[PDB]
């Protein structure tokens, strides 16, 4: 075992429960659900749909494509190779 | 497609939009306290005066 | 509204304390710079003179 | 819906709502010493005089 | 308190340490604040003249 | 080539694609409010006067 | 427009947080640029004389 | 309930109120000592004087 | 003291040496305000002019 | 050698090849917009002249 | 455009934020430069006296 | 209770317990050469006197 | 010498370098200190006038 | 040219962006250093007096 | 030895030093480029004048 | 000369470069220190007068 | 000459990045203190008056 | 015990032990140069003098 | 002992040594350019002087 510098003991031994130097309790314990010390209640259960505090609608459906609200197109279709803006070549292939 | 599919996130499509509803509820209740404060800073503080 | 399903491909795990934490810094970055640029609102701290 | 889906994150709705208890708690109790220590600012400091 | 459910889709152990983390931080902001934008502050730690 | 092909971060070419909609139309309005921000600026504020 | 396959090699769990995330971190600087390097941006705030 | 369910974390229920006393003793034996530290303050700095 | 059962979704292995890093952090940073915004303090180093 | 060889990346040689052309193309338009932005700030600056 | 075979070795996902991102910081760089070094840039935003 | 159980360290009670021997020896031998490198300070710097 | 167990549950590849780092860059942080805010450390390394 | 070994043992997509990344930085450095310390090249942005 | 062993970076001996030509020719295109700029900057500025 | 078994908890990997590097970082901090704080150190790097 | 079997427990990848890139740092670091504590280094960049 | 045991970092005790014999001389090495340094710096610098 | 042992960093000794020469021979390198570097500033700069 280590023989350390500093004379000894180096640790202090534990064969049981934790022993506070600052006294008892430590902990309080929980026989079942917890009880707030802010009174109550803690939390609102949701029963289903999410009731909104800010009215409704929250979100816009979505059926089948995006539908954009700056215009259209939104996007530019790829066929084949890539279309270069810059003109061409756009690479010296070894 | 599939609406069970399972995103790489782990959330469905249907789980993704429900949690956007707080994303969006909390925005607007950010909102409405921001709209608050700019009131009582309009009214006690020299902005805008 | 229509973004809801950016969760689909964002983890929430990721993106929401993103949110609420670069929401919270914005916050404390516009009190630093009206409290710095302004004469009232270190004034209104020091109160009576 | 399933009550005992475990979720990414490993814990359940019921899990995950009985934790939010010590949120809110901590929250309200932590609301509570900060309200203690704005009326002591108000009573010795010049602020709000 | 209806957001008891955030912990289903953000991690407990990056989610608290991070809000606890983030509150204290705040705190630490808002004192070094009101001692560099105040005279009353300073003084207090000075103390006697 | 194979549209169905899942790509390295799990989205195919359809996918990636519609999931670009979304970054071009936010990009988009993103410009229209910032258009409106350099107007209201430029009829404000003494920058090109 | 014809970048849409980007998301087919960039991740967007981090290519969309990194977006939105500079997008506003440069939108902060800008602010901060021209807050510190005009009078009329601090006098705005300032208000009232 | 089960006291046998491991948690994430690898710890049960009993071995993290366990680990919690040595957290509580260490912050009340930091507390005790900082006290001190105060009271020492206190008589030999200008402080509250 | 009712807490000790958040070391079952924080992991001690991360938990522990953030709150023993942070509280020794939160000390330094005291020091250096009391000695940055008071003249004993930096007066009581200097020692015999 | 192999064409088909699926390199550390998960891209193959003439997938990396497509994918720079973007890069290159993208370049080149940066490169574009940048000897605008030098011929307008020539043209209203007091630069070079 | 002989460089089209650097995806083989380094990861899109990695390189395509950076090379973006590390442009838009160069770019930030060089305006703060040159508003710090310069007297007609702070004075164009600063327009009419 | 198990001594022979190996925690999520890997480390065995009876490990850990011999490896903060070396932890406390070290603190020890750190605060001897810190109370020398005091008590020259004090003969030797106007600290104290 | 209580606390022996704390590496049952923190990884002494982690801790361990945090620690030794953490109280060398502490007495980094107090030897700035005091150079800083005396004039006999600073003369000290001056020596000769 | 003797060194064409190193990308065995040093991962090309981790060398190749700290390269590129840090002959950038060091760049920027160089730049920010002759801007600083002299005065033809902050003369040579502002031009016509 | 063995020309076909896959190194752990996955390269082998032959695909290093491939791609070590590129970073090799790289760095003369830089120094040439290089060159050039110190050439301009030395007939133009007053170093070395 | 007794600590020989860290290396079977603490990774040489991790610790080695730690040590290396934090032994060159304290170095660094000395030599900046001492010639903030002296007039013949930069004095010596002046030379001539 | 010999710590050659350092890199059997320090990985390569790791150690000869963190080698050549802290020499460049150090260098980097060693210049700019030089030009910022003497007279002639800033003045040879500046030549003729 | 086991002299054989491979710990969590895969050296054995007489493989750590083995490395610290390069950590200690190093010291011994780094010592013995920087006690020399400290000579010269006592004979040509106004310390101690 | 074993010649033949891939060690954690998956080097052999015979490994290791043979990439420690680049090491030392590019230290010598780094050394030599360094030299003639000192004797240059030596011979055009005030040092020593
Ligand atoms: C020689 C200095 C050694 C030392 C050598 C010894 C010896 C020898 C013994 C102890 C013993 C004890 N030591 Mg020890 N110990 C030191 C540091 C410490 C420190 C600390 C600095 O915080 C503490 C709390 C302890 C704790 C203790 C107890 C566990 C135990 C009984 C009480 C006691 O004080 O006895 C008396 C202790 C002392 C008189 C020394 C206390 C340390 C002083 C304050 C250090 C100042 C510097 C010293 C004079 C010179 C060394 C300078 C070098 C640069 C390091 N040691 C240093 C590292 N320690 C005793 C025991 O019970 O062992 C079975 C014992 O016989
Ligand atoms: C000597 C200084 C020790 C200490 C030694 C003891 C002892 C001894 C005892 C307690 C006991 C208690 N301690 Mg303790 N304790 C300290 C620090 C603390 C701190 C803190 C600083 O924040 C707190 C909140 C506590 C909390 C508590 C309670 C759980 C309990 C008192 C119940 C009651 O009504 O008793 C009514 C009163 C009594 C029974 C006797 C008086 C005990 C008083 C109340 C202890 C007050 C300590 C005070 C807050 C800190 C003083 C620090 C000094 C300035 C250095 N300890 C330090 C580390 N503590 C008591 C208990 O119930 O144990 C079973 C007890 O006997
Ligand atoms: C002693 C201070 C305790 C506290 C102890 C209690 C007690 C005791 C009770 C509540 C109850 C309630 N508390 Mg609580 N609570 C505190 C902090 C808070 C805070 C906060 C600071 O942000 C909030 C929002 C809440 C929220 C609530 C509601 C869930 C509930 C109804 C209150 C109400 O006005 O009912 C309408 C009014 C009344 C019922 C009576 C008058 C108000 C009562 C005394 C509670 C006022 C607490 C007040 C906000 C604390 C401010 C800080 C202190 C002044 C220092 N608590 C702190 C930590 N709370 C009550 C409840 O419904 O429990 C079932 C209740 O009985
Ligand atoms: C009390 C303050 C609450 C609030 C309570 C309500 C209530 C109550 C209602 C809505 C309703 C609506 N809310 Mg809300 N809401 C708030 C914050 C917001 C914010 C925001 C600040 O950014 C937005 C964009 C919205 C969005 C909306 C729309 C979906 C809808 C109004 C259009 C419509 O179809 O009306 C159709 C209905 C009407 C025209 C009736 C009158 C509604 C009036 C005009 C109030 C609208 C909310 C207003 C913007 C809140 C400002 C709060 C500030 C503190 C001043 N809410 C805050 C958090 N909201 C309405 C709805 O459709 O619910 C189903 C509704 O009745
Ligand atoms: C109301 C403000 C909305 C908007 C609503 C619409 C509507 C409504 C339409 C488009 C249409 C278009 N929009 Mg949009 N759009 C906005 C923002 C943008 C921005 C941008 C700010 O950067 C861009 C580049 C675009 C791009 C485009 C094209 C894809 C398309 C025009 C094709 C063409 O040749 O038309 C040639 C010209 C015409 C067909 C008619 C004249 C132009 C029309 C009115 C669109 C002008 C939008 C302008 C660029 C941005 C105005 C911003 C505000 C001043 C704040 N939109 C904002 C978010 N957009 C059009 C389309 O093709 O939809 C199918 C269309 O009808
Ligand atoms: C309109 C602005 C577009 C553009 C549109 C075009 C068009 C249109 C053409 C090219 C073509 C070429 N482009 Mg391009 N190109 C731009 C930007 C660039 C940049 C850059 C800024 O760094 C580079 C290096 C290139 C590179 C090239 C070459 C590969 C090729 C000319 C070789 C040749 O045969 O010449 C001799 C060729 C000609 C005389 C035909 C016309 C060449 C045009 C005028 C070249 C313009 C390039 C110039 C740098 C653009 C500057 C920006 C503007 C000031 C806005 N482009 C921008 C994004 N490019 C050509 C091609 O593909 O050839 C097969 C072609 O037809
Ligand atoms: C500092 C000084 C003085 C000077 C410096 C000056 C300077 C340099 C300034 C530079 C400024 C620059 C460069 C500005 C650039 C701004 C840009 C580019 C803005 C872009 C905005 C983009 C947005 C808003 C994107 C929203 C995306 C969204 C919402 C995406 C949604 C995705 C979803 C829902 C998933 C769908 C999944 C499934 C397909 C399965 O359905
Ligand atoms: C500070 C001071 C005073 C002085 C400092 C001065 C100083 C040093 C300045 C230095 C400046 C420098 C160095 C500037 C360099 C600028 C450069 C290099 C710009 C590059 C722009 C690149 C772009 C725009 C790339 C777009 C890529 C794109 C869009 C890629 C798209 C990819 C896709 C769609 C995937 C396809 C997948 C599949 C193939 C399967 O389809
Ligand atoms: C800036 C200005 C002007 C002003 C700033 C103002 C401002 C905001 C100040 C804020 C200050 C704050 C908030 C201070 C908070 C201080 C606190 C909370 C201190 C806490 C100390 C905790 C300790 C010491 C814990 C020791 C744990 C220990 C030793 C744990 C041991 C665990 C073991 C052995 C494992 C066992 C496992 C098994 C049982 C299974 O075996
Ligand atoms: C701050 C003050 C005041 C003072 C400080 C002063 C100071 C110290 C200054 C120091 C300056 C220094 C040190 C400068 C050094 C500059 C250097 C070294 C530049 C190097 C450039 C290298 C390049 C451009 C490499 C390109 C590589 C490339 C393109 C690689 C391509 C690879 C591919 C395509 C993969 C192939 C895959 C497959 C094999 C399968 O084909
Ligand atoms: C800023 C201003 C103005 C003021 C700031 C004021 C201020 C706040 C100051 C605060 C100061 C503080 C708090 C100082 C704290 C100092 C402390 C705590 C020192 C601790 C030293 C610890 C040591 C040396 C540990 C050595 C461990 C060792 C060698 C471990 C060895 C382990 C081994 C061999 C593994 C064996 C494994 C197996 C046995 C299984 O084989």
Redesign the interface.
């Given at each position: 075992e280590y023989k350390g510098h500093s004379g000894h003991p180096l640790i202090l031994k534990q064969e049981g429960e934790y022993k506070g130097y600052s006294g008892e309790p430590l902990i309080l314990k929980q026989e079942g659900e917890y009880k707030g010390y802010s009174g109550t209640p803690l939390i609102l259960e949701q029963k289903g749909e999410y009731q909104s505090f800010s009215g409704t609608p929250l979100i816009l459906k979505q059926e089948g494509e995006y539908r954009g609200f700056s215009g259209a197109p939104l996007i530019l279709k790829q066929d084949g190779e890539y279309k270069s803006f810059s003109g061409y070549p756009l690479l010296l292939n070894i | 497609d599939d609406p069970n599919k399972v995103?790489?996130?782990?959330?469905?499509?249907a789980?993704?939009?429900?949690?956007?509803?707080?994303?969006?509820?909390?925005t607007?209740?950010?909102g409405?306290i921001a709209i608050v404060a700019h009131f009582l800073a309009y009214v006690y503080?020299?902005?805008?005066? | 509204m229509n973004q809801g399903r950016i969760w689909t491909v964002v983890n929430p795990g990721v993106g929401l304390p993103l949110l609420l934490g670069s929401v919270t810094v914005i916050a404390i970055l516009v009190h630093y710079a009206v409290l710095s640029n302004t004469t009232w609102f270190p004034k209104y701290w020091n109160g009576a003179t």
């Open positions: - | 995103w790489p996130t782990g959330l469905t499509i789980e993704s939009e429900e949690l956007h509803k707080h994303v969006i509820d909390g607007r209740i950010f409405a503080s020299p902005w805008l005066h | -």
